[PDB]
Structures are given as C-alpha cells and as structure tokens.
C-alpha cells in the first residue's frame, strides 16, 4: 500500500515542491520531518508516502531527477528541502536544452541507471508496493525525455503496479519553445502503452480558473502548482483516510478504462472559491461546469465516457447520489449510451483543512481528441518544412519514427470520434 513518487522536468519538480508542502500540512509533519499533528489518522498512513526513520523522522517517498541542478538547487535550499534525505537528489549536469532525444535517446538515458537503483532501493523498502506516480509535462525535454524512458523500464520491471502520472499539456495559447509539438508526439508514443492512467493538464485552463473563479490577478507558478496539487491529494487520500466508499487507484482504473488505450483524464477540484454556500448540489455543479475543466477543452462539445467523483468530508450518501443521479438526468446526451451508469462516486469521511467538503471531478470525455488535434496539426506543418528537425536527426531520430509517432497518435484520435457517436 505504498506509492513511489518521482518528479522530473523543470515543470514537475516545481509541482511536486508544492505537492509535498500540502501533504506535510495534511498530517502536521514539520518541514524537517517530525510529526506534530494531533490525529491517529495523520499517524496511520504515513508509510503510504513516507519512510519512518529513527527519532520519529519521516522522509517522503519522493525521488527528484533532472539533467540541470538549478531547480533542485532552489528546492534543497528552499523550504521543504530538508525533509528529503540528500540521497534522493539524483541528477547530473549538461541539461537537454528541451531536446527529446537528448533526454530520451541519448545522454539523459545515461543518468537513468543512477535513477533506477534509487527507485529499486526505495521499492525494495516497500513491503507492499501499490503503484508509481510521476510529475512532468509533454512539451519539455527533461520532462518528457526521461519521463518516457523511466516509465518504460519500470513497467517492464513492475508489470503489476499502477502507473499514474500528472502531465502538463501544451496549450493553444503559449509556445514557450517552438519544439513543443515535437516533444508531445514522441511522448504520446510512450504514454499510451506504458502507463495505466494519466491526467492531462493545461496551464491555460488554470490561468482561466485563477482568473474567472479565484479572481486572482497574476496567477504565478506557485498558484497553479498549488491548484493542481489539490487534485493530487484528492485522488489518493481516500485510500489512506477512512471513508464510506474507499476506492483504490485500481478501483478507479477498472472503472475509467473501457478500452485499454483510453486512460487520459481531465481532473477538476470542486470547491474552488474566492475570498468573497457549500453543499453537495453546490459541489457537483462546480464539478459539472466546463470552466472548472483543468484541460483546455469544451466537454459539452465532447461526450463523457466515465466520470470519477471522489469526495471528502461528512456527507450523507443519498444527498450525494441523488444529486449524482440528477447530473445524468439533465444532460443524458452528454454521456455515452452503451454505459448505463456513467459516473462512479467515492466518499472519504475526512475533508481537508478549512473546508468542510471537497469533491474531485475526474472525467474521461471525447473532448480530448480536440487537444490531440492541436498537436497533430502542429505536427503537420512543421514536418513539411522539417523545421528545426536537424537537431533530432543529428541525435539519431528517423523521420519514419516521427511518422509512426503521429499515426499512432492519429490512431488515438480516431478512437474518440468513433465512440463519440
């Protein structure tokens, strides 16, 4: 019942920095590693995410990996940089410079042997492994490069564990680097085949959420990584804390994957409020809403396959499930016909600190073919010119491999249109 957590890329290590900040406060764990909470429930499932070291020390089950030290240089010097033992900081120099084959096909792969032994000794320390958990982006070099390479060796080594990851998707808004559609199409050639699930996340929808819901002026990277980390704890803490319908990640996995390639999700936090009511019908309307969709897709333009509704707090079941039933009753066209009940619930007894309730929308819609259309159309015009491709061909990548990447991606598009209507 323990989950390995690895953070890669400039994106994901920033996300996991705020993530472990939340979980430490979820149990009253000091930034040094000492327990100061007041509940046995804070005390019971520490082993799920931590290793109890002597003197009531708690080192998190977390491995930081990159090709450039500078992020971890800030983190280890920054707050919650002392909670890690310093063994976990597995990195090198000479970063990939947002080159996929540098992160995957070559250099970055040389660091991988140093990584997996630290994965091995951590997984050997687990008495009962339960799954793996990654944090990266798609359009990043050191995020997607080793991020595909690491999960390939692990699923070969651990064919039974749950392979979840939190994945930041390129937007129709920002092209930070122009090679971002080239990095996504190579990663989706690995993410479909080597994970059991993932979560698509856009920066742009979180820009929308802190603008139109939280009403915050300048949403920094601290705020969005605070925002995505709530759904990260929102997934797993029902397994840890007591609940009415306690559900494993595998209990999500058999509930959300009707076909073995479709495991991409749009998570969403329900009680997103500004500083200016709170019931289960209040929550589920925020769950249903397209503005709360943390992917840049119109889910009402798509259609839903399966919806996971994880809940937190003291809530009456019929108050949830009748309200859950009304969601299918209003827009029955929005769900697929060959699945009679399209939505799964899960209720944890314990809410997070401050709010008496919180829920988590996790959906598998047919709107995700839209975000696949952005990458493939951006793949097409760049591949015609072969524009700025000679770096990767200089790194040993063949055009057929890119052609086989996009067609396999185009295979994934053709599934969702098939199952939409």
């Amino acid at each position: 019942r323990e989950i390995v957590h690895i953070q890669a890329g400039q994106c994901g290590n920033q996300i996991g920095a705020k993530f472990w900040e939340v979980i430490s406060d979820e149990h009253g764990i000091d930034p040094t590693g000492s327990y100061h909470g007041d509940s046995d429930l804070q005390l019971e499932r520490i082993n799920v995410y931590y290793n109890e070291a002597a003197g009531n020390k708690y080192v998190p089950r977390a491995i930081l990996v990159d090709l450039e030290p500078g992020t971890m240089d800030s983190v280890r010097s920054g707050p919650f940089g002392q909670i890690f033992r310093p063994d976990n900081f597995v990195f090198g120099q000479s970063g990939a410079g947002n080159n996929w084959a540098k992160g995957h096909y070559t250099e970055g792969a040389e660091l991988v042997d140093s990584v997996l032994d630290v994965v091995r000794k951590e997984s050997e320390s687990c008495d009962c492994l339960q799954g793996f958990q990654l944090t990266h982006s798609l359009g990043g070099g050191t995020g997607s490069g080793m991020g595909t390479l690491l999960i390939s060796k692990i699923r070969e080594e651990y064919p039974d564990r749950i392979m979840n990851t939190f994945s930041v998707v390129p937007s129709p808004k920002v092209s930070d680097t122009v090679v971002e559609p080239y990095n996504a199409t190579l990663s989706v050639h690995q993410l479909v085949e080597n994970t059991d699930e993932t979560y698509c996340i856009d920066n742009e929808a979180l820009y929308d959420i802190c603008f139109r819901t939280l009403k915050l002026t300048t949403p920094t990277y601290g705020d969005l990584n605070h925002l995505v980390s709530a759904t990260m704890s929102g997934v797993t803490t029902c397994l840890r804390f007591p609940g009415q319908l306690n559900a494993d990640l595998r209990k999500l996995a058999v509930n959300m994957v009707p076909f073995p390639r479709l495991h991409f999700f749009m998570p969403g936090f329900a009680p997103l409020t500004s500083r200016g009511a709170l019931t289960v019908p209040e929550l589920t309307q925020q769950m249903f809403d397209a503005k709360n969709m943390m992917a840049a897709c119109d889910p009402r333009h798509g259609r839903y396959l399966t919806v996971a509704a994880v809940f937190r707090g003291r809530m009456s079941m019929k108050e949830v499930d009748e309200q859950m039933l009304n969601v299918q009753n209003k827009n029955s066209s929005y769900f697929v016909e060959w699945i009679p009940n399209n939505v799964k619930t899960a209720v944890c007894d314990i809410p997070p600190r401050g709010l008496k309730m919180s829920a988590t929308f996790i959906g598998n819609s047919t709107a995700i073919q839209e975000l696949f259309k952005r990458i493939s159309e951006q793949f097409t015009a760049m591949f015609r010119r072969k524009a700025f491709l000679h770096w990767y061909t200089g790194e040993g990548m063949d055009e057929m491999e890119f052609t086989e990447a996009e067609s396999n991606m185009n295979d994934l598009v053709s599934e969702y249109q098939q199952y939409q209507d």
């Binding site: 209990k251 509930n255 009707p258 076909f259 060959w338």
Partner: protein, 428 residues
C-alpha cells in the same frame, strides 16, 4: 442450536458493525464481552467474556482497522479479524481467483475451528453485495468450499442488490451476473437489498433527508435480529431457519426472497398511531415499503413469511392474515393456496441508542417470494448486455484470468433463471 456469521466486502462488514451493535444491546452485553450482573451467537469464556461467532474478512485493510481501533475491538477475538493487504480492485477475477485464493485457506480454517467449537450447527449467514469486488468475487469462492465441506448446512446470504438508477460503480452489472452463477448452484436462501428503497423508506416514513451508511444499516441490522436473534429465543410460535427452505423455497431455484419491516417510524409519529397487528401487516404489503425497487402488483406471489416481535395475540393475526386475502389485490399463484407462515416470538423489538426508530411494542418482518423479480433481473441484464456488446471493461478481467465465453455462459444461466420465473406464474 448455533449459527455463524461471516462478513465480507466493504458493504457486509460495515453492516456487521451494526448487527453486533444490536446483539450486545440485546442482553446488556458490553463491548468487553461480559454482562454486568443464551448460547446461540456467542461463546462465553471462563472469565465471563462472550466472544461473538463472527469473522470479518476483507482484502482492503481499511475497514477492519476501523473495527479493531474503534469500539467493539474488545469484543471479537483478534484471530477472527482476517485482513488482506491489497484491494479487490472491484474485479471478480481478483476476488474469486487471483487475490482471494491466498487468504481463503486461512479463512476456511477459522470457520472450521469455530464449527468445531459449536455443537448443533444450524448453518451460517454471510454478508456481502452484488456490485462489489470482495463481496462478489471472494464470497463466490467462499461458498464453494462451504457447499463441499458442509453439504447439509443452511447458507444464508444478505446480499445488496444493485439498484437500477443509483449505482456507485460502472462495473456493478458486470459482477452481478458472475455472482449469481456461483450463488444459484449452492446458496440455499439469499436475500437482496436495494439501497434506493432504504433511502425511500427513510426519507418518507422516517422523515430523514440525510441518510448515511450508518443510518441504512440500522434498519438492515434490525431485520436480521428479527429473523435469527429473536427466533433463537422463546416465543409463542417459534420457527427455526432449517424449516425455512421447505416453507419458502418451493423449487430448487427460487430461493431469492425479499425482506421488509413494517413498524419503521420516527420517535414523534409513533405517539400518534397506536400500532395494532392489523395495520402493520397491511404496511408490509405496501408497494412503497418493499425494500427492493420492484412493483409487487405486477408479480404473482408464491409464499410469504411473517416473523413477529413483542406482544402479539395470534387470534388477531388469523383475522389479519384473512384480511389480506379479503383485501385481495395481490396476485397469488394457483400452485400454493396457503403461502402464509406465521411466526410469533415473545421478544420485543429493541431500540438502538442513537437510531431514530421509536420503541414500538410489536414488530413484523416479512419475507416473500414474488414473480416481480424477473422485472428486476431484466434491468441488470440489459445493463450487462450493452457492455458485452461493446466488450467494455473486459480486459481488466481477461487480463486477470477469465474467458470471454464465460460471461456469455453466465448470462445464459441468468437467462435460464428468467425462464423459471416466467414458468412459475403462467402455470394453471
């Protein structure tokens, strides 16, 4: 004169929290096991402790620790609280084969140990669901060996029926068809419970718009006390559970009754109506208090038990049971003229200190076999059939060790059950 109680799944275990909540309150038994200043569901130690005849087994280690760290942990013996390490993952193939095989050998010995401690075993009653992974997979594996080793014992199943509209997992119709094939061959009398009607009775007759799983199981635990824990005590007309299967199950495969409970009332409205035995028996036969969402008017009746509690004059019951045939809007089969077994125990209905059921002097639990259930099976069979038409979600099962021909096979035995419930009503 004793019976055993297994609890499996997250459902039937959490029900079993409420069952043993009644039986300790039945006799002034503390969570310790002694009475401050009856040998049917317990084993008394020499120190005056009474250990229950209960084993709690689950693949999830969560809900078991809620028992052995919360209350009643001084009650059960800790060798009984069998605990897995990894979840069922809501897979039948996990519970029936893949995971539950490596625990059941420990589980079967505890049943074999307690049956050796028992003398005059009446059988045992298990607690599970239908849409579950542990309470459908592992309990299917569980009643296989019990039918082998104990071929002569009564097997009772307090299963939770998958409701038509409100359902909590997408794979619930996929596991019910797998469960019923294992059930139909070996289970002697299996009760189903639909959760929507537990809401429906409580939001109208109990006037509670906030039911939790605690508030549902107090009703469910009250019925199981009425079937067994009353009937192992003195009464005017006591009936044993061995003669049930010859009273209630007319054929090999008809052993699927519906339980209900008529004096369900709040604390306030019991002050208005003085409950007689006449109006209570009518309250059992209401279509709105059926505890499983079916239309009893659209189904013929075969046999109907009426188990009683508290002060009851049987002369009034014979008028009251004649009143139902006088108020004949029920459909009764021409096979059976007199499908009305009365049983009156002298024990009163007991109150739970915290539940919202008032202290009534009399209580009636009604078991019944109707032909309305083929309508209920047809809903779950449609929910199955579209998913197998798409081969939806099946790779979590054939990736775990089942065959695609078997889900077609198990539907036909479910479909063979639908032929029988059509046959029993049409005959004249």
């Amino acid at each position: 004169r004793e019976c055993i109680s297994i609890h499996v799944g997250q459902a039937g275990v959490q029900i079993g929290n409420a069952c043993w909540e009644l039986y300790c309150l039945e006799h002034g038994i503390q969570p310790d096991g002694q009475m401050p200043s009856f040998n049917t569901f317990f084993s008394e130690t020499g120190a005056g402790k009474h250990v229950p005849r209960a084993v709690f087994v689950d693949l999830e280690p969560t809900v078991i620790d809620e028992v052995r760290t919360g209350t009643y942990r001084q009650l059960f013996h800790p060798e009984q609280l069998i605990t897995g390490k990894e979840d069922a993952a809501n897979n039948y193939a996990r519970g029936h084969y893949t995971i539950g095989k490596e625990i059941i050998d420990l589980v079967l010995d505890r049943i074999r140990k307690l049956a050796d401690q028992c003398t005059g075993l009446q059988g045992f009653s298990v607690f599970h669901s239908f849409g579950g992974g542990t309470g459908s997979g592992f309990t299917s594996l569980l009643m296989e060996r019990l039918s082998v080793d104990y071929g002569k014992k009564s097997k009772l199943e307090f299963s939770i029926y998958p409701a038509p509209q409100v359902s909590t997992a997408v794979v619930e119709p996929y596991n019910s068809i797998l469960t019923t094939h294992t059930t139909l061959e070996h289970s002697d009398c299996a009760f189903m419970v639909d959760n929507e009607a537990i809401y429906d009775i409580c939001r109208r007759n109990l006037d509670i718009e906030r039911p939790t799983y605690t508030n549902l199981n107090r009703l469910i635990g009250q019925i199981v006390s009425s079937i067994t824990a009353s009937l192992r005590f003195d009464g005017a007309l006591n009936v044993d559970l061995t003669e049930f299967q010859t009273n209630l199950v007319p054929y090999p495969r008809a052993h699927f009754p519906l339980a209900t409970y008529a004096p369900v009332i709040s604390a306030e409205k019991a002050y208005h109506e003085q409950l007689s035995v006449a109006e209570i028996t009518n309250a059992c036969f209401e279509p709105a208090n059926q505890m499983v969402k079916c239309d009893p008017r659209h189904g013929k009746y075969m046999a109907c038990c009426l188990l009683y509690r508290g002060d009851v004059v049987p002369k009034d019951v014979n008028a009251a049971i004649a009143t139902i045939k006088t108020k004949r809007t029920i459909q009764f089969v021409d096979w059976c003229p007199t499908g009305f077994k009365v049983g009156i125990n002298y024990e009163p209905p007991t109150v739970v200190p915290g539940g919202d059921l008032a202290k009534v002097q009399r209580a009636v639990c009604m078991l019944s076999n109707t032909t309305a259930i083929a309508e209920a099976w047809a809903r779950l069979d449609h929910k199955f059939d579209l998913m197998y038409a798409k081969r939806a979600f099946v790779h979590w099962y054939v990736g775990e060790g089942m065959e695609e021909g078997e889900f077609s096979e198990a539907r036909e035995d479910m479909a063979a059950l639908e032929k029988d419930y059509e046959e029993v009503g049409v005959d004249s």
